[PDB]
Amino acid sequence: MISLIAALAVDRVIGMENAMPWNLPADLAWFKRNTLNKPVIMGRHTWESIGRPLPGRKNIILSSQPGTDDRVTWVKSVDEAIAACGDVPEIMVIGGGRVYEQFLPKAQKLYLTHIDAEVEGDTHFPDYEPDDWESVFSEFHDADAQNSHSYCFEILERR
């Protein structure tokens, strides 16, 4: 099973200048809980944005060019990325925009955080047909001293 996980600001913005400009510790904690002990697939730009391997996860990087770091696994196609995960129950696709576009048609589950923040961005999450997806979990949180915007955690499953 393939799942996508992402945090979306207003208008589905997910990044600007190869960065995420907000800081929401509760959402990073959610990301870690839902990805720990699973393989994660990311594109090369997202790998450069994160800047280090994510511990406790098999890190698989998509790039057309040879890898430059043997602490992670480098693959050259979507099918190779999937195969490099082995026989696991759930593969997590962690972006960015181009990668989410390619894996969305193959995904059974979306873990989305909707952030109440207006962000100038240059990268968006793919337009997804709402009729295809059932909301199975949602949890709203007001802003607090640690998290400066309100946010909604949602899990959607393909109908």
Ligand X SMILES: NC(=O)c1ccc[n+]([C@@H]2O[C@H](COP(=O)([O-])OP(=O)(O)OC[C@H]3O[C@@H](n4cnc5c(N)ncnc54)[C@H](OP(=O)(O)O)[C@@H]3O)[C@@H](O)[C@H]2O)c1
Ligand Y SMILES: Nc1nc(=O)c2nc(CNc3ccc(C(=O)N[C@@H](CCC(=O)O)C(=O)O)cc3)cnc2[nH]1
Binding residues: 5, 7, 13-19, 27, 45-46, 52, 57, 63-64, 76, 95-102, 113
Q: What residues between 99 and 118 interact with ligand X by CB under 6 A?
A: 99, 102
Rounded Cα gap, residues 3 and 111, in angstroms: 7
The minimum distance between CB 87 and ligand X, in angstroms, equals 22
The site for ligand Y (CB under 6 A) is made up of 5-7, 27-32, 46, 50, 54, 94-95, 113
Closest CA to 38 of 6, 67, 1: 1
The alpha carbon of 84 is separated from its chain's Cα centroid by a whole number of angstroms, namely: 18
12 binds, among ligand Y, ligand X, Mn ion, none (CB under 5 to 8 A by kind): none
Provide the greatest CA pair distance for the chain. 44
SS3 at position 106: helix
Distance CA 121, CA 48 (A): 17
Which residues are near ligand X by CB under 6 A?
6-7, 14-15, 18-20, 42-46, 49, 62-65, 76-78, 94-99, 102, 123
